């Protein structure tokens, strides 16, 4: 049951037959060899992914599916902070509500509708067997049921130990099985004493049982537009990615430009970074934060382009109170954080850590 449903999702996950032209599965964009992110080059490098039509580019970077199972369903907490959900703008409530979206998205897998997806499933005798044993006879004949059933199988598959093994050096260090290097231990200390802990730690205080390095909140850190991605996506030179405000039901103008805080697990191997894939290097993503803190001119320069970071896409509702910590990260502390963030890489991707350091 919990075994079988996941097993069926394992199969759907790698099945390109869920795309219009049968070129693309979840695995194509969310590649298990790359911590469930897209190794493919498109017109905006690795910043955005190309759909089943071989031509359409999305407008946001493909996020890891590792540890996405730990994110709570979307909600507004009592302090009026929105939390949780899936997609960078929280517009899906949870894994299951998210799973059908790639399938119907003409920019992604591009099936025309539920009926077309059902007809695909119905063609494979193994799905008729697998789906019917879990959901009942004729499930594959009801396109709504079939589509919901697939979403649920795929959500269950992402909740297995294999998406979230907690077997990074950090996990091993938190068990006492090993120690951090001096560089990593200092990086860890910085992380917990600087402003990063205000956003990239499950809890405000106390100890998380399964830390995934995000509070699941939404913050506008004042990222510029990724021009080449935005051009590839075709959304227009006047388009504004409103972040969370794009979630249907969110009306509050103070939510414009806020994106879900991402889990920093596997961050070392899931470049490029931010919701639009704007920065290539991990160090760049960390150096961004100095722009709120440092008085040095270099702090306002994106080291990857040599030009200013850029005007924020949405110049309002910046998280200035967390961002403007009054303290700049020197290069010792940036190296220390890079070393720390690398300890967050799952055991199986430890070998990818070499071709980036």
């Amino acid at each position: 049951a919990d075994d079988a449903l996941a097993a069926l999702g394992a199969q759907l996950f790698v099945d390109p037959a869920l795309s219009r032209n049968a070129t693309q599965s979840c695995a194509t964009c969310h590649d298990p060899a790359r911590a469930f992110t897209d190794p493919r080059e498109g017109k905006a490098g690795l910043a955005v992914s190309v759909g089943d039509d071989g031509q359409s580019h999305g407008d946001r970077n493909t996020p890891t599916l590792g540890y996405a199972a730990l994110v709570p369903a979307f909600h507004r907490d009592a302090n009026g902070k929105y939390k949780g959900g899936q997609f960078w703008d929280g517009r899906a409530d949870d894994l299951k509500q998210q799973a059908g979206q790639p399938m119907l998205n003409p920019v992604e897998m591009a099936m025309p509708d539920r009926a077309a997806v059902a007809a695909r499933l119905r063609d494979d005798p193994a799905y008729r067997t697998g789906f019917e044993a879990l959901f009942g006879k004729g499930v594959l004949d009801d396109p709504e049921r079939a589509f919901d059933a697939a979403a649920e199988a795929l959500a269950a598959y992402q909740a297995t130990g294999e998406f979230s093994p907690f077997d990074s050096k950090y996990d091993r260090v938190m068990r006492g099985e090993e120690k951090f290097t001096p560089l990593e231990e200092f990086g860890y200390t910085v992380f917990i004493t600087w402003n990063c802990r205000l956003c990239h730690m499950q809890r405000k205080q106390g100890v998380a049982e399964r830390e995934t390095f995000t509070n699941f909140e939404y913050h506008n850190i004042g990222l510029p537009v990724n021009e080449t991605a935005r051009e590839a996506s075709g959304l227009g030179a006047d388009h504004v990615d409103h972040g969370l405000l794009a979630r249907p039901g969110i009306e509050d103008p103070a939510q414009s430009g806020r994106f879900k805080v991402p889990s920093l697990r596997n961050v070392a191997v899931t470049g490029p970074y931010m919701h639009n894939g704007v920065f290539t290097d991990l160090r760049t993503a960390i150096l961004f934060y100095n722009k709120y803190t440092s008085r040095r001119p270099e702090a306002k320069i994106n080291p990857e382009t040599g030009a200013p970071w850029g005007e924020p896409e949405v110049a309002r509702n910046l998280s200035l109170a967390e961002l403007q910590s009054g303290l700049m990260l020197d290069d010792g502390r940036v190296d220390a954080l890079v070393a720390f963030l690398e300890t967050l890489t799952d055991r199986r991707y430890e070998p990818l850590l070499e071709e980036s350091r």
Binding site: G176, V190, S325
Partner: protein, 125 residues
């Protein structure tokens, strides 16, 4: 009471300088001027910087990372002064140095020292 004796943490009174979470506090316990173990008193501004320490909790046998944080923008409370230095390192390792007025990121640029809070932020390692 022997100031020179090894510090013995207790887990039963947060207003005393041997409360286990205060193992590297310097200043005043915010609970004593209208705050709480982990909240600031009214009118003061909560810093975002902190210094840490690994404090042994004699209730559970576990050591915890306590990230101190100052309540700023008021003259020093003068109530429940305490000074401990478990694992406290000199100023050149400021993430463990507790003479510094950790009032950075406090609203309104408040930098005066009123008192300090002792929230846990991790298990120690």
């Amino acid at each position: 009471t022997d100031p020179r004796a090894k510090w013995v943490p207790q887990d039963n009174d947060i207003q005393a300088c041997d409360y286990w979470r205060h193992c590297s506090i310097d200043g005043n316990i915010c609970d004593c001027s209208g705050g709480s173990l982990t909240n600031c008193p009214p009118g003061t501004k909560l810093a975002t910087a902190s210094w840490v320490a690994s404090c042994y909790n004699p209730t559970d046998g576990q050591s915890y990372l306590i990230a101190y944080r100052d309540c700023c923008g008021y003259n020093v409370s003068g109530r429940c002064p305490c000074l401990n230095t478990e694992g406290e390192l000199p100023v050149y390792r400021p993430e463990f140095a507790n003479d510094i007025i950790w009032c950075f990121g406090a609203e309104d640029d408040a930098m005066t020292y009123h008192c300090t809070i002792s929230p846990i932020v991790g298990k120690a390692s």
